[PDB]
């Protein structure tokens, strides 16, 4: 969902599964 991501480039990477690494719980 990359919705919880409160970043720009991070959330704007179209890679939730990839972003989840640096944006997990």
Q: What is the C-alpha separation between 1 and 18, in angstroms, rounded?
A: 11
Cα radius of gyration (the chain): 7
Based on the shown chain and the rule CB under 5 A, indicate whether residue 10 belongs to the binding site for Zn ion.
Answer: yes
Based on the shown chain and the rule CB under 5 A, indicate whether residue 5 belongs to the binding site for Zn ion.
Answer: yes
Based on the shown chain and the rule CB under 5 A, indicate whether residue 23 belongs to the binding site for Zn ion.
Answer: yes
As a dihedral over the C-alpha atoms of residue 25, residue 14, residue 11, residue 22, rounded to 10 degrees, the angle is 40
Q: How many residues bind Zn ion (CB under 5 A)?
A: 4
Based on the shown chain and the rule CB under 5 A, indicate whether residue 16 belongs to the binding site for Zn ion.
Answer: no
Task: Give me the least distance between CB of 20 and Zn ion, in Å please.
Answer: 8
């Amino acid at each position: 969902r990359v919705i919880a991501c409160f970043l720009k480039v991070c959330a704007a990477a179209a890679n939730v599964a990839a972003h989840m690494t640096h944006c997990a719980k």
